[PDB]
């Protein structure tokens, strides 16, 4: 492990690279084995966070804040890694999360398993590129087999039971499985409310995921509208407004002010009195314009002053101030209103409508929130999460993100493979059959790919207390005997091994992305044979 070790065949200094004495290098099979060791360490860390009986990890950051989670992407992001192959595995999980939002632990476990099998193949002397090419071949076979055994679900708003089952499968492994169906239902309703069916797009900016300590997890609900962390501007305004005609404004309720450098010169008592009357009349004109539009509520983005606040109160115009741009946008979208930049441009048509605007309390806290709901056809939505601690609230947020991403993936492609390791077992069977029909030296690489695909069912069995090899062999034999690629691991011990009957459901895009990403990253890792670093 050194950059250059000669110093010359003549005794004269041999300096080629800067700080070559402080620099290191690993070349060849030892570099490959170091990579495999790092990847195996990461994967063996992650495999215990896989499945319903999977356990969580408690991450502590630089400043000592605690994060309890089962999400592989969050774990590997919070993990203070120094190894570059482990950094690649963190990138792998992040990529699975970006593209899919689920599978972030399966990808890592599977990639680690592929590298662990490549280890024995390299011991037997196969070229790492030949291993990578056999892995590509087997991965293509497995992807087509997934397309083959896939099923389809209806993504309609009438019967949402298949989507609820998919979301429940996604949320089975998370701490929020205490409110399993409630969480699944609200993730489904959220995406279906905010989803472009024709475009097949789902903008998550239209889903506001808010958390507030207090209450119970069961109190988490879907608001068809908006929630804001603000209150009415005056403490004597009413805390409830029903059938609210809302004026959304990005103009501070203050006297106008040019953006250009300006100096208004007062040169006489008459000029001073004119200025005074101008200010008074500006405040009165603002409030009068808001009133003549017919609004019963105003929502500004930039705060206002004492005269405007008291005039709103006097004129029976409850008002919120210092509302942020994103929530202003969501309020406009939800209430059907248009964002107005100045009072002169305000009309009865630019107003939004909410059947209820309320200020909500949270016990012995002094904190208030504003709920806007009972809109007609809100294309925006809010998920308000409650719970007994900020750790379970943050975990609920990320778990519900997983469920929303899964429903998004169904809206993008409704095809569905059955989980519990059943899809992996079926793909392993297909890859084994094709390796049997393959006469080149990659037969070994494809057999290794199959043995690696079989690590997810083994991991599920282990986490569920079952004997990995026994359970997997029995369910594999059953799959080959009675043709049913929906036969998998009974993690919850419902008796049956039929995942189609247990309604354990994954997205085809999810499994395909797992396989493809794991294989591509394993390829880039096997292609590395030299490490240099200080």
């Amino acid at each position, epitope marked *: 492990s050194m950059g250059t070790l000669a110093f010359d065949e003549y005794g004269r200094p041999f300096l080629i690279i800067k700080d070559q004495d402080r620099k290191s290098r690993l070349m060849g099979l030892e570099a490959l084995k170091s990579h495999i060791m790092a990847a195996k360490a990461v994967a063996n860390t992650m495999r215990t966070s896989l499945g319903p009986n999977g356990l969580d990890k408690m991450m502590v950051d630089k400043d000592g804040d605690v994060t309890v989670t089962n999400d592989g992407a969050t774990i590997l992001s919070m993990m203070d890694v120094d190894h570059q192959i482990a950094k690649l595995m963190v990138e792998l999980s992040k990529s699975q999360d970006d593209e899919i939002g689920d599978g972030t632990t399966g990808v890592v476990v599977l990639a680690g398993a592929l590298l662990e099998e490549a280890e024995q193949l390299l011991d037997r002397g196969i070229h790492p590129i030949r291993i990578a090419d056999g892995y590509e071949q087997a991965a293509r076979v497995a992807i087509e087999h997934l397309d*083959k*055994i896939s*099923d*389809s679900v209806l993504v309609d708003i009438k019967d949402t039971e298949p989507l609820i089952q998919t979301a429940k499968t996604t949320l089975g492994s998370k701490v929020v499985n205490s409110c399993h169906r409630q969480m699944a239902e609200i993730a489904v309703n959220a995406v279906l409310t905010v989803a472009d069916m024709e475009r097949r797009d789902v903008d998550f900016e239209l889903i506001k995921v808010e958390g507030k300590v207090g209450g119970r997890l069961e109190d988490t609900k879907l608001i068809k509208g908006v929630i804001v962390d603000k209150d009415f501007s005056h403490p004597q305004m009413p805390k409830k407004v029903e059938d609210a005609k809302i004026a959304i404004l990005t103009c501070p309720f203050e006297p106008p002010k040019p953006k250009t450098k300006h100096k208004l010169d007062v040169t006489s008592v008459e000029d001073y009195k004119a200025l005074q009357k101008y200010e008074k009349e500006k405040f009165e004109e603002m409030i009068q314009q808001i009133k003549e539009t017919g609004a019963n509520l105003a929502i500004c983005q930039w705060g206002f002053d004492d005269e405007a606040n008291h005039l709103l109160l006097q004129n029976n115009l409850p008002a919120v101030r210092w509302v942020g741009g994103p929530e202003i946008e969501l309020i406009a979208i939800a209430t059907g209103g248009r964002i107005v930049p100045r009072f002169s441009e305000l009309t009865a048509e630019k107003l939004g409508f909410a059947g209820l605007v309320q200020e909500i309390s949270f016990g012995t806290t002094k904190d208030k929130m504003l709920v806007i709901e009972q809109c007609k056809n809100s294309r925006a939505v809010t998920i308000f999460i409650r719970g007994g601690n900020k750790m379970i609230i943050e975990e609920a947020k990320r778990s519900l993100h997983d469920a929303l991403c899964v429903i998004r993936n169904l809206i993008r492609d409704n095809r569905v493979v059955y989980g519990g390791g059943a899809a992996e077992i079926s793909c392993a069977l297909a890859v084994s059959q094709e390796a049997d029909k393959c006469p080149t030296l990659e037969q070994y690489a494809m057999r290794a790919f199959a043995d690696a695909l079989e690590v997810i069912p083994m991991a599920l069995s282990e986490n569920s207390g079952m004997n990995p090899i026994q359970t997997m062999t029995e369910v594999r034999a059953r799959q080959v005997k*009675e*043709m*049913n*690629p929906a036969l998998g691991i009974d993690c919850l011990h419902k008796g049956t091994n039929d995942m*189609k009957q247990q309604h354990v459901i994954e997205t085809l895009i999810g499994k395909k992305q797992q396989i493809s990403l794991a294989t591509q990253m394993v390829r880039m890792i096997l292609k590395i044979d030299d490490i240099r670093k200080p």
Partner: nanobody, 104 residues
């Protein structure tokens, strides 16, 4: 996707090939408004029809996912077009695959 071939006493066969992973049930139909002569499941369980039953020897070869119908007691009213149906994969309504039918 699924290519289906078809080949007093007679025997008519129907065999399936193509893209699939399971043929859940195989049935014989006759074409009048279409009816099912008989049908057999993977577990061998066969249910016959009402206007003709008990003289049927429909047998299923799982090794090649094909079926064989042995009919005796021939009659002029058995003279029609015989269609076979094969439920493949998960058994959804878009999984029933018909043959072109054999006119006797």
């Amino acid at each position: 996707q699924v290519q289906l071939v078809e080949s007093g006493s007679l025997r008519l066969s129907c065999g399936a090939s193509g893209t699939f992973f399971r043929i859940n049930d195989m049935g014989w139909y006759r074409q009048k408004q279409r009816e099912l002569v008989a049908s057999i499941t993977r577990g061998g369980t066969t249910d016959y029809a009402d206007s003709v039953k008990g003289r049927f020897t429909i047998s299923r070869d799982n090794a090649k996912n094909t079926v064989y119908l042995q009919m005796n007691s021939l009659k002029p009213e058995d003279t029609a077009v015989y269609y076979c149906k094969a439920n493949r994969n998960w058994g959804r309504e878009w999984d029933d695959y018909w043959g072109q039918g054999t006119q006797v």
